[PDB]
Amino acid sequence: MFRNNYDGDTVTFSPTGRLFQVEYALEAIKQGSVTVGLRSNTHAVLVALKRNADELSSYQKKIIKCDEHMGLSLAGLAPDARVLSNYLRQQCNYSSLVFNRKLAVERAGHLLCDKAQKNTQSYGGRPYGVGLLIIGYDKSGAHLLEFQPSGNVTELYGTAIGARSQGAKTYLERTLDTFIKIDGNPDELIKAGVEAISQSLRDESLTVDNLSIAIVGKDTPFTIYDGEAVAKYI
Amino acid sequence: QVEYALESISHAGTAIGIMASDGIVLAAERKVTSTLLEQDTSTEKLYKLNDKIAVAVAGLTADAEILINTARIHAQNYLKTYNEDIPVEILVRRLSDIKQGYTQHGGLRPFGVSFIYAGYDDRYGYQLYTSNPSGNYTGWKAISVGANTSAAQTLLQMDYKDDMKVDDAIELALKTLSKTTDSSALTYDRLEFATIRKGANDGEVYQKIFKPQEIKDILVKTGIT
Amino acid sequence: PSISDPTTLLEAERNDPDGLGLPLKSVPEKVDAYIKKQFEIIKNLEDSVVGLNPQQFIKTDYFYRTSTIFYWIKEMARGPNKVLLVPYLVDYVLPFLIGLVKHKDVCALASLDPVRLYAGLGYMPIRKNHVAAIVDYVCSSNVALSSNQTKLQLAFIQHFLSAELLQLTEEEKNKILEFVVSNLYNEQFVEVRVRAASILSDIVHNWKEEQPLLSLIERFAKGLDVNKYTSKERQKLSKTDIKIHGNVLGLGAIISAFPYVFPLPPWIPKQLSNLSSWARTSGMTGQAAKNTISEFKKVRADTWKFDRASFNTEELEDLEGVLWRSYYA
Amino acid sequence: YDRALSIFSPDGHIFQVEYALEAVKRGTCAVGVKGKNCVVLGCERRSTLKLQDTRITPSKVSKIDSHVVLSFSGLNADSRILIEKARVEAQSHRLTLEDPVTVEYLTRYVAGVQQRYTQSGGVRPFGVSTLIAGFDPRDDEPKLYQTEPSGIYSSWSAQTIGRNSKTVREFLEKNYDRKEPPATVEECVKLTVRSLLEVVQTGAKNIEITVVKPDSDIVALSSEEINQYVTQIEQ
């Protein structure tokens, strides 16, 4: 009954200045399970609800370590999160051996924007269909970034991405003055994130394997908790 | 999945090969063409491969001349390699395999041509063969390709005798063409003619690709005016 | 049909109660007994095969008779002969294909396609008298068929219903409805429920009155009302309970029967909001709900700009997470 | 009748070779049977046009090496390229490893070229099958194999690739038994004879049959021996 003429390729513009194929790639982020990130001045936290195919299945990986001081999460598409995350690992290793620095998390953001925008501009290719929440620590302090498949990245105190994220996002916006003052205490920042993700589970319930958590900042390397390690946060 | 290339050759004028008990006889007919298109050229019907082998062609000269030159190169290379000239069977198989490849490989097109390879070598004696776009080839006592193939093969079948002399094969080729001619008379300028025979008297292979006057002389032997 | 007079022909054409008349072609009574005697010989021979593997079966007289009668049915099912084959589709030809469908590896060693021949017989030139007998036979559960034997019968109701749509009477269509609805609750077989739901959508698409529809919606929605269960309870139920599974499959068949109605009926948003609570549950019941919502959204992507006015923000948000595939982390 | 809900293309994919496999049925009958101590291949001869020259016509049955033979149904032009590839590979093995090519390696390599002409996409598969048979070096077990345009290959106690080769296969299944096969070449030949005289597109020019025996004893039966083997009972 309708026939969009301007959404067939990533290189077409709509008569109104829209890149529909990049908007449909943002609609792909709302296909994956919820993830939350939040930060204070000393720490930054990711928390993710992991899905499975069946009760006999293992759980799908949501959180990836890119270096000892940063890593990300992946709502929407799983295989598009490994192409970006592999490149982000390469660029961290390269920054260590070429410059003797840890990659700055802002610098990592620009490198993702660069890689993503190229796919948005060229024929035959498709904009990424994955949303990354990147957390890290560097000389400027603790950081959280939201990467969007159009080629854009945003500095945030906290956010949520994936299916039914508006609940967690609305809780973070209401709780902001509280979780940004959680300094020198990592467990309360994890609990504030796990309470935020609990607002997106509409009737559902966390379990050791259905929940994954990660933290970075100050004296703490990037660590991932899932399985029995999340038992004290349920 | 090549039958359109076999349709292509059916229009392309006519070539007759007839094998005697003591030789072979190639005849072919040039299509009538524009007054100003040049005739004195390299693109004809009856070509050659070596002093023992000749070909007549149906289908386009642009596909013929590449294979004719490949055959000349391969025959020169064989004579250079062994100091005894290439067998007719190895020439037609070598040319049958090149042609098969360009038909099965979808990065290439089937050669729209079909040559009648006449020859002599001592492993099998005089050898008359036909090859076509599919890359298959067959040995014959007589054969024809191109225009009027069907009508010519009936007249070949009802007159051909296994014991016949080369001179009887001259008559049979000329009389077949004068039976199945598209023009209501036959003339030396439309006719290309060749023979492969046992020397002047001694053991050598003697080709003749006939000049226009020798063609006039065999036409006035054979009662075609 | 060689009649002695044109006037006797006309009187026999008049004498049909429906309004039609003496069929174009019919098998004489000696040939009739012969054709039927071939199927009875096959039935008596069934005890000669009961113990044995496919290669031995392929050596039997019963297989040779079965192969000959298979080929005879297949030639009769082409061209002019279907009118001489329709009458036998109650106790001879159509039943010979349900038995032969059970011998899967014999139908691989021999090139026999009883599944394809049977489903294709749904498009035969059947007539009023034969429609009722076909419906009564097809709607009889009492044969105790296996998962695919009763799923080939289900597939034969889909092609027949679409061949005889606008011929089938309301009692015949009600027998077809209650048969496919009884198969939504099939206690042995998971895929027979899923195949029956697809034919309920097919029945429900051709309903033009709201009282039948609101009654079906209540039959299915009554047995899945989301407030009655705890979360872990609703989850363990969705791995185990055939009635809620059949209810969720049935409610989804009704919603799938409405692909393109432009001003979205207000009952669709409401019933989707009951299925979306089941879509969060992982088991056999949760897949049916996820699949319903996904297929709805796929056909509504053309008009979603206008359809999303018919839902709340909470209701739209509850349609989001349905597409559980390996590559959507 | 897999329309279902008027569904089309729900898998989004296709794979197809079978146009080539149909030509492999159209073509001349080719049948092979093991004995206890032999393998016999027999192949149908095509009727020859009035003006052909027979002196140079290939035997259809084709030696690759003194212990190994190949025969085929399918396109003759394609079959030459496989026979030529099998002959250069057999010479290449025999040179480079100082021992004759094993029958299964030859079949694995012939299957290797039919696999590559399936996989590469820029070419069609060869319109032909192979009947590869013989004996390994220093062995007297008879060995008999097929390849198909798909690049699938298989081992057979008897086999027949042709248009009317479904009734040959039924006659072979009716009379062959792997508990007690036709032992002597006499029985083995007479059974490929009975196969070929049933359903081949026969005439006054009929069938070419070749016995292979162990230790490179490869022999085409004479046009008299294929007639001497016509021993009958009729009523």
Add this chain to the structure above:
Amino acid sequence: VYAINGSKKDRFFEKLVSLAKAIETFIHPSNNGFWTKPNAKFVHAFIKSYHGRVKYEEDICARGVTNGICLTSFCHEEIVEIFLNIISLGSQNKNPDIANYYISCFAYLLELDPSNAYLIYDKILIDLYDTLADQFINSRHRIISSLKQFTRVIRFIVMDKLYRVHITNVLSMLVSKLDMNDTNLTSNLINGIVSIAAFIPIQDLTGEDDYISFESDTLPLVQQHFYHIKCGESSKTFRVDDELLNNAFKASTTVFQSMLKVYVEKIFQLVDVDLEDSLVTKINQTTMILQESMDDKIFNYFASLLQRNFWSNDSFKEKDPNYELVTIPLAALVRRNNGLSKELVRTLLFHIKEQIKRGAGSVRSTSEIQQRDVKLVLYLTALNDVLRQCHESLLEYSDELITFMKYLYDNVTNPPLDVITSIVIHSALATLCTTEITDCRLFPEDSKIPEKDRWGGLQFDPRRFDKQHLSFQWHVPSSDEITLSISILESLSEYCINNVEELMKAPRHDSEYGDMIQKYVLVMTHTLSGSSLLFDPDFNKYRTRDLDIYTCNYYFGNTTEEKLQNPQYLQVHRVRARIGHFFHKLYVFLSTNFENNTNMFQILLHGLKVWFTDLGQETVFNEDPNAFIDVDFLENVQSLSHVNEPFTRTNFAIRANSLHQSRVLLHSTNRKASKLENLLLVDIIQLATSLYPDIYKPAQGTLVHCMKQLVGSYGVVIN
């Protein structure tokens, strides 16, 4: 479609709703396959055949009593409720011929007058306002299908007191939206514009109501009505005073002079565009139908606007402009008003003299009109087109035109221009001897009184057939116009006769000698055509009670004594004998001196075709686009399948014109050859036997035309 029962209908309609419920999913645009064409043709035939049954019943009912099997109002309402969604889906199809089947269904449903008809109008206005507001910008098929849907139903929207208030807002929005890049959208907008114009009078209906204005009267009733129906409510709920509604209608009509300025500005932009002969022809037809729909007040405005833009423009800069888009509109002005021609004909020939003195046509090329020749070609094609419509107004400036024609045949000799410049005599002589329609107006002469409620052009009003509505003035050649036609014909023909004989010494092949011969010969061919209505197929029979059925208007006589007793009759035939003997003399000259000159024998063969074929009739320039409205085009806009002649006055006028043109062409030209025809036939047979393709192909085409004209000619040709 003949099984329904008007008084027992419910079980039939219950089956028909169940058919539509089964079918709906096979009609939806994303579901294409083998069923699409079956369904589109089924839905069209069902609605069309139901309409034909209703009109058969309405005709029987009007001479007596309703039988009770007859379809009632309730059946027409059921047909809309069943099929409206089927038509709404099938009109969005990816195949455009499929979509046209469903779009033509709206017209049958709306002619049934169901109480449901508001559903169809509301559907079409909402889509149309959403396209013109660019709400479907991403979705091209909506724009095209909505324009097609509206185009189909304008003639019914125009008749309804509520929906008629929208039409000049739509006409204004359509005209503003004409593109120079989107020839497909422009074609569909031009379909809308011509459909509005054919039914509506382009007239201001405001009396002394000076307080009302399009904005604040029409628009406030088009913003309230559109907002009401867009928020899901129906037109049946929309209540307003008849007084606010009639003020909104009267104020709708005051906007027409603004629309026409934008239209002329789009017409002068379209001159620069790479269009197609069919779209150019359609754009001319809509410009002429706009003009025939104007009152004299709006026409007198439009004429000055067009004439002003024709002199003051930036619009002929491209290689090969669409001159017709401006020059056919000027010729159409002069068909409506002869009083415009004297100034427009003296301003054109002044500008031709200016361009010829400034050097246009001084540089030779056979293949092209050069960039410096473009303005000369504009003013000459404008002159050719205007002169064709001058009639009795040529009598004021006849001598000035004849001395200008001589100047033009002295001064310009570029071979591409000789054809354009020789059409000047054809147009002059042709307008002096032709009988044809002058007046095609929607309403005559600013006259009669059919009320101000005539948004429809009487199409359905039973008073369309009236003698005081269909009293067309026509054009009947005067005796002064006939004394001028003969003076032009013998002056120019004798002129070129003394030019080519003073220059027939075969001096050399100058490449400019050949062009002067070709020119004076082309002028001799443009005088035979044009003056052709004066000639007579029978002249040779009447040497030194015969019955015609197809008797056209001749100005010499219908009986042989009536025409022999006029000396003007002999004189006309005498000139055609003198021209015919000249082509035989020219043939022996070009045969003896200029063999192989293909262009000179081609021009001679076209002259011989005209001399053989154009007796009492004209069969070249007969079927190219001209400044009359196209009978096949207006009949496609106005024809209804089961309605008797649902036509406006323009269409009745051009149908009476087409009857006259049919009576002229159906007159026999077969004759017994005259010694000069035998001589020229034998010259044509030798040219058909020529060995240059470019001579023999035209000469064989001329030979087959000659064999239709002469009895026994096959025997002569084969001999």
Add this chain to the structure above:
Amino acid sequence: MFLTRSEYDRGVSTFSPEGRLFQVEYSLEAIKLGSTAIGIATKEGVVLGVEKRATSPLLESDSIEKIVEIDRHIGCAMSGLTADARSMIEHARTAAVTHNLYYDEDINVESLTQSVCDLALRFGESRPFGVALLIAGHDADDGYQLFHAEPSGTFYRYNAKAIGSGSEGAQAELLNEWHSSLTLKEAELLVLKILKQVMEEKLDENNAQLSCITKQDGFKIYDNEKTAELIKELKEKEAA
């Protein structure tokens, strides 16, 4: 029967308005159409079973093999043996031998599963590639493992998985029957029980092939005689 098509169907590398790649979804459901394969993982071994097509008595052996060895430690099962299955297997074989000669150590089963998925993302060198695989093996880090490798170039680890003919009711009986406590014998009986139910109740050594991975023998396909005594052990154990 009605029609439910969409304007974004058959869109290659193209997102629909929902963010869906329908080509990879379509490829991922064609896994329902092939021959049935079943995997059971236990603390004692991984068992792979497949339905075999019936063959002529004259067929002595064939190179159709739906269960294949990748390495001593790793075995694999298909529902179809297209050219793409062959391509994935000979890539997995070349990946195993290259890791062996680089680290002097056996490839982890996850890392080999990842490698065949990377081949499907590369398309050899948003398209799907090839066919569903069950991949079974043992390594010293993550023990006995069973993976479903998918035409999408993505995968999951399962405790038990069915693919091919029978999908809804095939995995329904496996999740009902699987224990952490299964012995290897009990897992073999369970794959034979499942195979019997999907095959419309037929079971011979001529239509069921079994294999297992253990540390001690590695990957082995069972002889017809070994599967025949296992089928008799099923036939008596259900009748008891």
